[PDB]
């Protein structure tokens with residue numbers, strides 16, 4: 038599946054190079070620009086557990102998911118991963134728990150020590 042493909046072919050985009058966030062570009066984006074710390078970023082996403090059985094998608098609305106990049110408003114893996122993305126890029130991320138919900142998890146949906154997968158489409162980004 039797409040998770041195993043990220044395991045096997047994904048780029049490790051962590052500073053520690055600990056394979057905690059692995060990335061495949063599924064669709065190439067436009068130009069060269071990637072978002073700055075503090076930029077408002079606008080994405081669509083589909084997320085799911087690898088180990089267990091849980092799925093959620095932003096397209097559950099015609100409303101992009103928005104956050105401020107690099108401010109700890111989202112799990113660590115998203116701050117790391119979305120920073121690398123160009124406008125219009127789709128990427129797959131496979132995320133070890135250290136870069137997500139760790140040993141606590143987020144009960145009941147997300148167990149302890151859970152690996153997560155996301156497909157992210159970076160729609161746009163804009164400064165304050």
Ligand SMILES: COc1ccc(CC[C@@H](OC(=O)[C@@H]2CCCCN2C(=O)[C@@H](c2ccc(Cl)s2)C2CCCCC2)c2cccc(OCC(=O)O)c2)cc1OC
Pocket residue numbers: 082083084085086091092093102109110111112113115137138146147153154
């Ligand atoms: C700085 O570290 C963290 C920052 C923020 C969080 C909270 C979870 C945080 O979730 C996320 O960071 C990730 C990436 C952004 C999309 C949502 N995220 C999820 O994990 C979602 C997943 C879907 C499928 C999965 Cl499998 S996991 C998760 C699904 C159930 C609700 C919690 C979000 C979050 C940020 C902003 C809004 C939000 O929900 C809507 C709302 O509140 O309006 C939830 C956890 C953090 O660490 C555990």
